[PDB]
Design a protein around this ligand. Sequence first.
Ligand code: HEM
Length: 411
Amino acid sequence: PSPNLPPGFDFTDPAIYAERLPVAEFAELRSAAPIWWNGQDPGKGGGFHDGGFWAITKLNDVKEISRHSDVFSSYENGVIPRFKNDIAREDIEVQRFVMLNMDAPHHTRLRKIISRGFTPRAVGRLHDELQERAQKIAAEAAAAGSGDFVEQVSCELPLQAIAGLLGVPQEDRGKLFHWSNEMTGNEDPEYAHIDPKASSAELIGYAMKMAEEKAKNPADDIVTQLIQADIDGEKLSDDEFGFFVVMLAVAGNETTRNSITQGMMAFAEHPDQWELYKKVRPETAADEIVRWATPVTAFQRTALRDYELSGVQIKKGQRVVMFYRSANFDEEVFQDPFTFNILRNPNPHVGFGGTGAHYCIGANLARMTINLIFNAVADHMPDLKPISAPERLRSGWLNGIKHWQVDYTGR
Ligand code: HEM
């Protein structure tokens, strides 16, 4: 029995996400066709011209694909499943220069090096400065009385996290943030004029300039650690560092921002959870917010060989799209998945991907950013109330909130 979906429904259609999350449609697949071929008409494949893809809606399938990276490749078609329909193939393949879109062994080398900058020590050293900034952000927003939660609360701290990790001087953080905000959102009319390719070129240039500067004058931030050769001569070239910085902007900015915005949307919809958060401040909240927000709706892989997955035959060369937004509400894994429960524990969500070679290296940095900012929101604007509905981002793989008017005070 075919799933009850509209003829031609495409789960990567940006026009859906500009309006809503296709929650009921995902649940229909989980029940009636947990692995479902998503057909795509000619020229409507968001940059991919292969007829469609396998929709992966169950968490254990998402995990199986993510563990078997030897079969399911990130390099072959990249992991973003939707661009503008007219994007040139070469602009897809230039994205192979970031570690996210690499397969082993190239990925293994880069991840090993880049792991130097995401040790628990490197991340935890940012705690106090980020905590201060979180408090300052929330204080300034509340003093404005009312405004755009996305811009006055959610946007800044993720960017300051990246700047702090990289040791970006304060004078430069303005243009770093600008470049990072021009990397995604390309398909929304409000951002139709951003040029992601131009922005990345400038970022790489700035990043390479910082790499050579930091070689001359080592410090104790991670840039020095990344570009200094270890015993085996391993280190990031200047351009490899540039592509690393580009990836941090792509992977660590709007995702965390959107977790914060939608975390607060969840709290506004579930005031008992909000009261419980304000009293207890449970850090488990961070994972339930990420599960609820699932900022990355989906990443894809490409089969390098035939592979049978939960009784479905994936063919060599076919794309499989991991719908984290569906898997994070999988009734077979989660107790009451549609209950927002900041105490959920354990919380095996795949908001940071499925466990495997590409698992989000910034997951704990993100969790700390979320906990710090929501502590500050609780400290400075505990009676925050929305004014109007959120505006969603037109994107086929990012679950974004562009704007959200809130009254930071009671009235
Ligand atoms: C809520 C916030 C975030 C979410 C939802 C998120 C989500 C993800 C996902 C789904 C992946 C792919 C995992 C896979 O394919 O198995 C990923 C990878 C990655 N993330 Fe995150 N991320 C977040 C925050 C961050 C931050 C703050 C950073 C760094 C500052 C970061 C850096 C990375 C990097 C470098 C990768 C590539 C790892 C690799 O390819 O080996 N992310 N992230």
